[PDB]
Amino acid sequence: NVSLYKYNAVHSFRNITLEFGYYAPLIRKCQSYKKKYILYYLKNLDKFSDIMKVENGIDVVDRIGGPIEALSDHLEDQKKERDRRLRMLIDQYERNVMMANDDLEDEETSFNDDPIVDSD
Amino acid sequence: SKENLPWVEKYRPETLDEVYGQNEVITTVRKFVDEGKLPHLLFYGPPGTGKTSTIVALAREIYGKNYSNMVLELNASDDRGIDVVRNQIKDFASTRQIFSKGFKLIILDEADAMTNAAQNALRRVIERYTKNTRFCVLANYAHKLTPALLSRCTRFRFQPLPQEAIERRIANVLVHEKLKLSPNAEKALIELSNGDMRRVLNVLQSCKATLDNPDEDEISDDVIYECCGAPRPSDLKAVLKSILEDDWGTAHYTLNKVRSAKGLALIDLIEGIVKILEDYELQNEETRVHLLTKLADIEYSISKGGNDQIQGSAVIGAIKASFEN
Amino acid sequence: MKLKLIVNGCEAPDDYKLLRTTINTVASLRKTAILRFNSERLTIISTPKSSLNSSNNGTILRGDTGQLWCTIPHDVFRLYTVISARELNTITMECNCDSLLSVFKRYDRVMNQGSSSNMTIKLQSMPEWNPICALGITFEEIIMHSFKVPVKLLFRAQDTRIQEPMINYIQLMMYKLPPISGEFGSAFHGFIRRVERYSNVNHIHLMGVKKDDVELKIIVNELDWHLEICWNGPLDSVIDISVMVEKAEQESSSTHEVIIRCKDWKVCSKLYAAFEEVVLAISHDESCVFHCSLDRGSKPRERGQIIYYIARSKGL
Amino acid sequence: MSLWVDKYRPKSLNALSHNEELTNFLKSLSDQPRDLPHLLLYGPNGTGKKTRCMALLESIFGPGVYRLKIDVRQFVTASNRKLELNVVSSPYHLEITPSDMGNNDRIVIQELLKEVAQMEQVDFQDSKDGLAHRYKCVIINEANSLTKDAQAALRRTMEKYSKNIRLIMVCDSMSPIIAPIKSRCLLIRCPAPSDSEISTILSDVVTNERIQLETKDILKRIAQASNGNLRVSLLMLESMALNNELALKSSSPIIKPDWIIVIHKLTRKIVKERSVNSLIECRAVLYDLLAHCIPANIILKELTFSLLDVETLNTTNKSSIIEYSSVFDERLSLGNKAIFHLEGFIAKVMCCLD
Amino acid sequence: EQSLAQQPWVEKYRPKNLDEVTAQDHAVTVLKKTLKSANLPHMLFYGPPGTGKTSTILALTKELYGPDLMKSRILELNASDERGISIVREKVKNFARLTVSKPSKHDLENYPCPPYKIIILDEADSMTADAQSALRRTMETYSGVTRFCLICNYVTRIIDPLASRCSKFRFKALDASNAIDRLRFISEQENVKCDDGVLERILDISAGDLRRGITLLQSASKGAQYLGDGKNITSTQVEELAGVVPHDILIEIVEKVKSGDFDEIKKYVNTFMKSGWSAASVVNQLHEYYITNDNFDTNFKNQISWLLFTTDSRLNNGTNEHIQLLNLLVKISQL
Ligand SMILES: Nc1ncnc2c1ncn2[C@@H]1O[C@H](COP(=O)(O)OP(=O)(O)OP(O)(O)=S)[C@@H](O)[C@H]1O
Ligand SMILES: Nc1ncnc2c1ncn2[C@@H]1O[C@H](COP(=O)(O)OP(=O)(O)OP(O)(O)=S)[C@@H](O)[C@H]1O
Ligand SMILES: Nc1ncnc2c1ncn2[C@@H]1O[C@H](COP(=O)(O)OP(=O)(O)O)[C@@H](O)[C@H]1O
Ligand SMILES: [Mg+2]
Ligand SMILES: [Mg+2]
């Protein structure tokens, strides 16, 4: 749900069990650590503009299913948290459609050349 | 109206005199009705041996032409759960006859499809109302019947149809129709029947359809093989000879040619070769073991599809290895 | 792009009713509606091809093909100040039906209370947020109640892509439905709503046969028993991978049939109950058009039009 | 931002960069898509089959195929068990993964797909007179995971309603596909990219991301470690770049999926010690792996090929290992619980090694 | 023109009448003469995929009844429909008991209109044994007004009583000898230019399935049209489209097996499976190569035939292709 509603990416459950479930959380954790370090440096003080786009409460940064320790109502609560985060994700995308759409390339400059006029 | 019917239904026996191949059972039931001492009956046998026909004919003999009024017939196409047994069968068995015509008859065709609960409920219904009602059960698989029900019924076994009965029925059909059958064709038809009259009738109808001019054309064994698309005995003999004498390439070519000549199926060839080998005199017994095991495995694999050429090569190799012992 | 408009319900109630019905139908048909403000009339459009509507992918998932077009002459509004720099001074917007419907419901409540104020509508640039603007609506309540609705403007290229469907008029059979205000209005209203008594029915087969010289029938074959409903009352007849849909050969030159959905029939029933003059046009195995016309004269005035096009739900 | 796997996803046939013959064949398919037959793309996982399917759909319809939304479809079983499926839809095509419903996948074929096949898509013509009809495209992900009943239910739906629907199925192996389904589809083989092409793609990504690369040998090593899986190659590239401050070096470790290292450790333990207690520990490891929803067949394959790489083992041991692997893979296919078969395979391997 | 060219060739060239059905004369003759005898029995069509069973039954129904009457005389159910025991006992039974609908004057004058209905159970082998048993007496009781047609690929899945009740028709495999004329006609209708022997190669590759051959021909035609060079299609292109392993790759595999080194075989197989070749095709090609080779002895051929049979059965069970292929190659190497 997070991937679909934040990155417009659709992935299969099999790929999550095999590859994404481990690689994606590690990448997001590294990105979050870098973002925190950069924020601390700025507070104490564009190239990495894709790194501070990770949200603390919406991005998964933990291995799905926990670590594989082999040789080195919890379910209800997890479902409630999933539903909550899905509601926030739907809220984030709901306004995006009306806010702007790709549509096609038009004469946008001419549109600004005839601006609205409001006066009584 | 009978003309439009398929031959399997058009030639259904109407009287017990028309049921062949079950002389002992038929005589017993006929004399039972003559003495009016019919017990609870079980008819156990393989498909198309005359169980349903026999029971319907017996009902007709007992009740004349109005048997439908005092005979309750139920089969697998109807629901026969425990509720049905408790209500419908029980009420029918516990009510008086329409015109005091002796006892009532309940026929449970294909009773091996009934549930254990319904069969258990049937025990006391059968026992309590024996005076007013008699039960008839028909089955192909006895293991589906509970021990109590089997104990309550007098058992009669319908054997696979003997050859002579099939010949007499075929002669009756041939005189009915304007059809001619050759002795070799009749022999092949009996061989492929496997004691089932339905197969005989269906194949005969297909053969008549195949004839260009049935008013004068005679059915030969070739017509039967064409209609059934089955291998000829000569083809099976040639394939077996090539497998047991020629080299791998020659045997492969022979099998491919024999199959492509008439589009024969590999399973039919396997069955024919198994039948042929069942009569072979083997001086080594391990050969029989290997033949049976490998051919059964190949048949099971074929039943699920797979690669046809690989299966044929497997048959060839299995036979060769078995006979190399 | 000034769009100052004034709406009054105490003068010419027919126009206010027409506008209310148009907004209600567009809201009940789809989430968003297109509004074209020309120098002559206002066009309200509900089409699956709209930028906001196409996102829902209704066409490929539920067969949402029907198109609804309403024309409102500028005489409806007390003040019609529409100035633009496009063809015939046309300004195109894509608004959300829910907010507009709520605003009009509140206006109706206020009017029913007893107020006789006027509603002023204008286009404004909200600094809070195809740029998105606001539709400022203001009115008095015997207290200046003001509400604003987000709106998105469309370019000329976007405007020209939304075109009204055109039907083969020569190969089209039109029937003039009895007026609702007449003695036969209730009978026909019940006849239209009859099929609603069957919950599981999803498609209806409308048929029209010559020989008051024509007859109309509704056929349902989705039940265990064939069902036919006939109207015996008076009824007068007006005298890429894209491929063409296959049309079944006509049974006779004087019979026109089409299979449609029950939701479209309910919408048509609502339209019939709304307006007086209603015409049903059938293109055999092709489509069904519901045309509601409101007539007003002074030098006859412009005719208020509501056209609902419904594509065949199934082939014949 | 989005993961580099999706960030640099090609969005057109002309944007493809490996297996040019397959690209040309796909382009030829899109020349006259009116009579496009049902398609079945088969190939190794992560080679770009879904990407090529989307590129073909884009060529047939346009970029709008990439505007995807998600809906929830509710189904009810005979026992009243209510469950849900995710339907990914675009204005021109639909995407479904019936295997997510397990043994109930057939229901999805019987109710949803059939309905989609039965509802003809028609629309008013913008310019010409009369309606226009277009067939709907449906993608079935993980086709090889469908039960035989669902595959059987697909047959007449594909045949009778060919006018209104065209199926595009994708799979990693055609062995589980029943013969009637294979007969009804145009089979398209999708080879994996070569190491050179993977290295070229990774170098392009590196140049785009301004990541300092000491030498191109790192990309070749990553491609070798990925075993032809481009998605895995990109994921490990991103992980290594992030863990090395976006400055890769020949000494930077190559990150592999954790379950793979776990299976390697299990193989080492199996080779080292062979006893009942070792078997119980191996069972614990197997149960831990299964707890993460790793398929049993994948576990067996990975364990078998990890065992075959051990140098101390001889030819006889490897032959016995592969024999047991084949037998127990068949048992898993025909079985109900995977633990029995995996434990039996490990026990047989322990017996053969000792 | 576009409307006609909007269908795949398999559906576009589906036989319309019984005359268009090819290579299945042994049953088509009986079905055709049934149009005059009006003595249609219960039918059990069985055969391998894409041999013309569904086409034959559809053509027979169309010829018997016609476009209008069929809608009231035909009840079709297949695997996509629910066919539980309750369905068999209620819906099928109700239809079988339905009175024969009155034909119209046009129907009587134009079509024979036999006085019974037809129930078609396509993919009957998917039905449960109990549901099949529920049909036994329904078929017999109402044979005067209803006839049943079961269709299947695996006849053993039909319970013995039903097979006994039904007259059996086996559809033969369609190969280069009995189905070449239909494929040539289809190619001529589409102006597909191909080298001599290409159609025979397609039929040989299809292995008894004319649907697969037609699809392959359509794919080759599309490729040739896209190329637009005016050259005739070649057997190499057909093999590439069909997924046939090139001869050189098979020779390399054979040499690797002959070498007998486990590690080299493992590495070569690991590299080979990257291409995505289907294991079934590789096994079939290996069987063809080894069984027809004159450089091997009888014992080797027997052992390899059994090994190939075992591997093919395992693959048909839906197993991992890499493991099975490696095991087969190692076993052949140890021979
Ligand atoms: N003994 C028989 N004598 C003459 N015709 C027979 C005989 N048995 C079977 N037939 C023929 O085969 C048809 C079917 O016979 P049935 O008695 O219904 O078969 P069955 O013994 O009931 O097998 P099952 O258990 O129902 S599969 C009859 O209508 C006859 O045409
Ligand atoms: N005997 C045939 N004559 C002509 N065309 C055929 C024949 N068999 C198959 N075809 C072609 O293949 C298509 C499929 O034929 P079908 O009758 O559906 O085969 P099938 O036997 O039903 O296969 P299964 O059992 O459903 S997998 C037809 O539309 C034809 O184009
Ligand atoms: N030609 C290509 N150029 C660049 N990246 C590619 C190409 N083909 C595939 N990929 C990458 O491979 C990844 C996985 O491909 P995908 O289609 O999901 O594999 P599968 O065949 O398993 O569905 C995608 O994220 C995509 O970026
Ligand atoms: Mg019987
Ligand atoms: Mg079929």
Q: Whose CA is nearest to atom 8 of ligand 3?
A: D48
Which residues crowd ion ligand 5, with CB under 5 Å? E 54
SS3 D349: helix
Q: What angle do CA E315, E319, E322 make, to 5 degrees?
A: 90
Smallest CA-to-CA distance from D39 within E8, E201, E2, E318 is with E8
User: In Å, what is the CA distance from C49 to each residue of B288, C64, E73?
Assistant: 75, 10, 43
Q: Does the Cβ of E214 fall within 6 Å of ligand 2?
A: yes
Domain ranges of chain E: 1-174, 175-244, 245-335
Following DSSP, what letter does each residue of D267-334 receive, concatenated? HHHHHH--SHHHHHHHHHHHHHHHHTT--HHHHHHHHHHHHHT-SS--HHHHHHHHHHHHHHHHHHHH
| Concatenated DSSP letters of B283-316 | S-HHHHHHHHHHHHHHHHHHHT---HHHHHHHHH
Pocket of ligand 3 (CB under 6 A): D 5-6, 8-10, 16-18, 45-51, 201, 230-231
CA-based nearest residue to D164, from D140, D135, D138, D122: D135
Cβ-contact B291, B277 below 8 angstroms? yes
DSSP B194: T
CA gap E89, C14 in Å, rounded:
60
Angle between helices B163-176 and B183-193 (to 10 degrees): 120
Q: What are B267's two structure tokens?
A: 């399973």
Q: Read off the tokens for D131.
A: 């309606």
Rg, Å, chain D Cα set? 23
The distance between the two most distant Cα atoms of chain E, rounded to a whole number of Å, is: 79
Cα-based distances in Å from C45 to C4, C32, C310: 20, 9, 14
Instruction: Provide the residue type at E305 as one letter.
Output: S
Which helix (H) or strand (E) segment is E119 a member of? strand E117-121
Task: Find how far residue B14's CA is from the centre of its chain.
Answer: 19
Burial of C281 (0-12, 13-18, 19+ CB in 10 A): buried
> Which of A98, A114, A118 faces C125 most closely, judged by CB atoms?
A118
Residue C63 is encoded by which pair of tokens? 């067969």
Nearest to D174 by CA among D315, D7, D49: D49
Residue E283, C-beta contacts closer than 8 angstroms, at least 6 positions apart: B307, B310, E308, E311, E312, E315, E325, E328
Strand partners, A49: none
Ligand 3 nearest atom to the CA of residue D54, by list position: 17
Chains B and C touch (3+ CB pairs under 8 A): no
Give, for ligand 2, the residue of E11, E14, E62 to mutate: max count of ligand atoms closer than 8 Å to Cβ.
E14
Q: What angle do CA E171, E177, E179 make, to 5 degrees?
A: 55
- Inter-residue contact B209 to E34 (CB < 8 Å): yes
Q: Structure tokens of B282?
A: 């083997």
Which residues, in sequence order, are CB contacts of C267 under 8 Å at separation 6+?
C25, C28, C29, C66, C290, C308
Give the pairing type, strands C3-7 and D131-133: unpaired
Residue D37 per-residue DSSP state: P
Q: Do residues B232 and B225 lie in contact, with contact meaning Cβ atoms separated by under 8 Å?
A: yes
Closest CA to C283 of C177, C204, C171: C171
Per the listing, tokens 């089979």 go with: D187
Cβ distance E33 to B229 less than 8 Å, yes or no, reads no
Alpha-carbon span D326 to E151, nearest angstrom? 35
Burial class (CB in 10 A: 0-12, 13-18, 19+), B37: exposed
A4–D contact, CB cutoff 8 A: yes
Are both D195-248 and D258-353 of the same fold?
no
Q: Residues of D forming the annotated binding site for ATP?
A: 5, 17, 43-51, 231
Token pair of E122 as six digits:
């396509």
Other CB atoms within a 10 A radius of the CB of residue E19 amount to 11
The closest-lying atom of ligand 1 relative to the alpha carbon of residue B140 is 25
Distance CA B271, CA D22 (A): 46
CA distance D85 to D107: 11
Contact between B202 and E41 under an 8 Å Cβ cutoff? The reply is: yes
Asked if residues E48 and E173 have their Cβ atoms less than 8 Å apart, the reply is: yes
**C126, A118 contact by CB (below 8 A):** no
Task: Judge contact between C275 and C21, C-beta under 8 A.
Answer: yes
Torsion of CA B155, B160, B166, B168, to 10 degrees: -30
CB E121 within 8 A of CB E149: yes
Nearest ligand 1 atom to alpha carbon E160: 27
Amino acid E185 reads F
Helix (H) or strand (E) holding E74: strand E74-77
Closest Cα partner for B167 from B184, B185, B180, B186? B186
DSSP code per residue over B115-170: -HHHHHHHHHHHHHTTTTEEEEEEES-GGGS-HHHHHHSEEEE-PPPPHHHHHHHH
Taking a C-beta distance cutoff of 8 angstroms, is the pair E101, E69 a contact? yes
Which amino acid appears at position A108 of this protein? E
Distances (CA, A) of D81 to D74, D78, D110, D288, E91: 10, 7, 16, 30, 25
Concatenate the DSSP letters of all residues of E172-217 into one string.
Answer: PPB-TTTSHHHHHHHHHHTT--B-TTHHHHHHHHHTB-HHHHHHHH
How far is D189 from E275, CA to CA, in rounded Å? 8
- The conformation of residue B86, written as its DSSP 8-state character, comes to I
What are the CA-CA distances from residue B194 to residues B19, B189, B198, E47, E92 (Å)? 18, 9, 10, 22, 30
Q: Helices (H) and strands (E) in chain D — how many of each?
A: 15, 11
Relative to beta strand D69-76, strand D82-89 is: antiparallel
Instruction: For residue D84, give how far its alpha carbon lies from the nearest alpha carbon of chain C (Å).
Output: 17
Distance (Å) of CA D155 to CA D139, D179, E231: 15, 11, 36
Question: What residue type is D342 in one-letter code?
Answer: L
Pocket test for ligand 1, best of B9, B17, B52, B137 (most atoms within 8 A of CB): B52
Q: Return residues 49-88 of C near A (CB < 8 Å).
A: 51-52, 55, 84-85
Residues 6+ apart with CB under 8 A from A59: A2, A6, A28, A32
Rg (CA), chain E: 25
State this model's resolution in angstroms. Answer: 2.2
Q: CA dihedral defined by E101, E107, E112, E116, rounded to 10 degrees?
A: -10
Beta carbons of B161 and B195 less than 8 angstroms apart: yes
CB A89 within 8 A of CB A58: yes
Read off the tokens for C90.
């046309």
CA of B206 from ligand 5 middle (Å) equals 23
Round to whole Å and give the CA distance between B280 and B292. 13
Alpha-helical regions (H) of E13-159: 25-37, 53-64, 70-73, 85-87, 93-97, 105-110, 129-133, 136-141
Pairing of strands C287-294, C144-147: unpaired
Q: How many CB pairs under 8 A join C and E?
A: 6
State the Cα–Cα distance between residues E19 and E15, nearest whole angstrom.
8
Q: How far apart are CA A105 and CA C114, in angstroms?
A: 50
Rounded CA-CA distance D256/D292 in Å is 16
DSSP D29: H
**DSSP tag of E94:** H
Please work out whether the CB of residue E22 comes within 6 Å of at least one atom of ligand 2: yes
User: What fold, for D258-353?
Assistant: Zinc Finger, Delta Prime; domain 3 (1.20.272)
Q: Cα(B309)–Cα(B248) distance, rounded to whole angstroms?
A: 14
Residue B22 main-chain phi, psi, to 5 deg: -135, 50
The secondary structure of chain C, three-state, reads: CCEEEEECCCCCHHHHHHHHHHHHHHHHHCCEEEEEECCCEEEEEECCCCHHHHHCCHHHHHCCCCEEEEEEEHHHCCCEEECCCCCCCCEEEEEEHHHHHHHHHHHHHHHHHCCCCCEEEEEECCCCCCCEEEEEEEEECCCEEEECCEEEECCHHHHHHCCCCCCCCCCCEEEECCCCCCCCHHHHHHHHHHHHHCCCCCEEEEEEEECCCEEEEEEECCCCCCEEEEECCCCEECCCCCEECCCCCCCCCCEEEEEEEHHHHHHHHHHHHHCCEEEEEEECCCEEEEEEEECCECCECCCEEEEEEEECCECC
Angle between helix D296-308 and helix E321-334 axes, rounded to 10 deg: 40
Question: What type of residue is C51?
Answer: S
Flag if C130 and A103 touch (Cβ within 8 Å). Answer: yes
**Cα gap C177→C278, rounded to integer Å:** 6
The DSSP letter of residue E42 is: P
- Please answer whether residues A119 and C4 qualify as being in contact, where contact means their C-beta atoms are separated by less than 8 angstroms: no
Pick the CATH number of D4-189 from 1.10.10.10, 3.40.50.300, 3.30.70.100, 1.10.150.20: 3.40.50.300
Q: After which residues is chain D broken (C to N over 2.5 A)?
A: none
- Cα separation, D337 vs D331, in Å, equals 10
CB distance E10 to ligand 2 below 6 Å: yes
Torsion E150-E156-E158-E164 (CA) sign: positive
Return d(Cα B314, Cα B14) in angstroms, integer.
50
Task: Give the DSSP letter of residue E233.
Answer: B
Q: Which helix (H) or strand (E) holds D180?
A: helix D179-183
Instruction: Tell me which amino acid residue C46 is.
Output: S
Looking at CA atoms only, how far is residue C224 from chain E in angstroms?
11
Which residue, among C1, C302, C232, has the nearest Cα to C124 in the 3D structure?
C1
Report DSSP state, residue D34: G
What ranges make up the beta strands (E) of chain D?
39-42, 69-76, 82-89, 93-96, 122-124, 131-133, 136-140, 165-171, 186-189, 212-213, 247-248
Residue B307 structure tokens? 């690669």
CA distance D222 to D256: 10
d(CA B276, CA B270): 10
The arrangement of strands across the sheet holding E146-152 comes to E74-77, E117-121, E146-152, E43-46, E167-170
Is residue E46 exposed (0-12), middle (13-18) or buried (19+ Cβ within 10 Å)?
buried
Within 10 A of B6 (CB to CB), how many other CB atoms are there?
24
- The CB of B49 under 6 Å from ligand 1? The reply is yes
Options 1.10.10.10, 1.10.8.60, 2.60.40.10, 3.40.190.10; CATH of D195-248: 1.10.8.60
DSSP string, chain A: -HHHHHH-----HHHIIIIIHHHHHHHHHHHHHHHHHHHHHHHH--TTTTTTT--TTTS--S-TT----TT--HHHHHHHHHHHHHHHHHHHHHHHHHH--------HHHHHTS------
Residue E136 CA to residue E131 CA, distance in Å, equals: 10
| Backbone φ/ψ region at D309: left (φ over 0), alpha (ψ -120 to 50), beta | alpha
Please name the residues in contact with E136: beta carbons below 8 A apart, sequence gap of 6 or more: B75, B76, B77, B110, E161, E162, E165
Task: Specify whether the backbone of D122 is left (phi greater than 0), alpha (psi in -120 to 50) or beta.
Answer: beta
Q: Return d(Cα D155, Cα D145) in angstroms, integer.
A: 16
Query: Are the C-beta atoms of D130 and C245 separated by less than 8 Å?
Result: yes
Spatial separation of the C-alpha atoms in residues B240 and B243, rounded to whole Å: 5
Q: C140: which strand partners?
A: C144
Ligand nearest to the CA of B107: 4
Q: Which of B77, B252, B294 sits opposite E134 (nearest CB)?
A: B77
Instruction: Provide the 10 A C-beta neighbour count for residue D198.
Output: 24
Instruction: Provide the token pair at E250.
Output: 């098979």
Which residue in A7, A8, A10 has the most chain D C-beta atoms within 10 A of its own C-beta, making it the best mutation to test that interface? A10
Residues 108-167 of C with CB under 8 A from D: 161, 163, 165-167
State the DSSP code for E157: G
